[PDB]
């Protein structure tokens, strides 16, 4: 997926791997490497008016 | 602010507030804002 990865302060428990949100969107993930909790946020977008 | 002995102080605007609103209007807005929020239009800065 595409997004802006930034540091996270989620209090993940050791068994927990995948984060989630109100409506089935993974806003956090655990590295399959040296452990580090990381956030996921899509980059900027908007509409255009002329 | 003398009108035949009538008192309109609770509905006329007062310049002692940043929002030029009457007392009853402030009560109404406070009652409705239980779910109305005072957000900043939720810009792209929502990345906390
Ligand atoms: C028109 O009506 C308004 C209110 O409906 C009147 O204003 C009210 O005046 C009373 C007494 O002057 C205030 O009571 C006092 O308030 C102070 C606030 O510090 C308190 O320390 C005193 O112990 C006392 O309770 C009342 O607060 C005030 N209301 C408001 C909203 O300011 C006004 O006097 C009326 N017009 C005329 C010409 O009488």
Coordinates of C-alpha atoms in Angstrom, one line a residue, chain A residues 9-43:
Chain A
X9 CA 2.8 5.7 20.2
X10 CA 0.3 2.8 20.0
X11 CA 0.6 0.5 23.0
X12 CA 0.8 -2.7 21.1
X13 CA 0.7 -5.9 23.2
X14 CA 3.4 -8.5 22.3
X15 CA 0.9 -10.8 20.5
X16 CA -0.7 -8.0 18.5
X17 CA 0.7 -7.6 15.0
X18 CA -1.7 -5.5 12.8
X19 CA -3.3 -2.2 13.9
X20 CA -6.8 -1.1 12.8
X21 CA -9.2 1.8 13.1
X22 CA -13.0 2.5 13.3
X23 CA -13.7 1.4 9.7
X24 CA -11.4 -1.6 8.7
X25 CA -8.3 0.4 7.8
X26 CA -4.8 -0.6 8.9
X27 CA -3.4 2.6 10.5
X28 CA -0.5 0.7 12.1
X29 CA 1.8 -2.3 11.4
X30 CA 4.6 -4.2 13.0
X31 CA 7.9 -4.6 11.2
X32 CA 8.8 -8.2 10.2
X33 CA 12.3 -7.1 11.2
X34 CA 13.7 -5.5 14.4
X35 CA 10.6 -4.6 16.2
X36 CA 9.2 -1.1 15.7
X37 CA 5.6 0.2 15.8
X38 CA 4.9 2.2 12.7
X39 CA 2.0 4.3 11.5
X40 CA 0.3 4.4 8.1
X41 CA -1.3 7.6 6.8
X42 CA -2.1 8.4 3.1
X43 CA -0.4 11.4 1.6

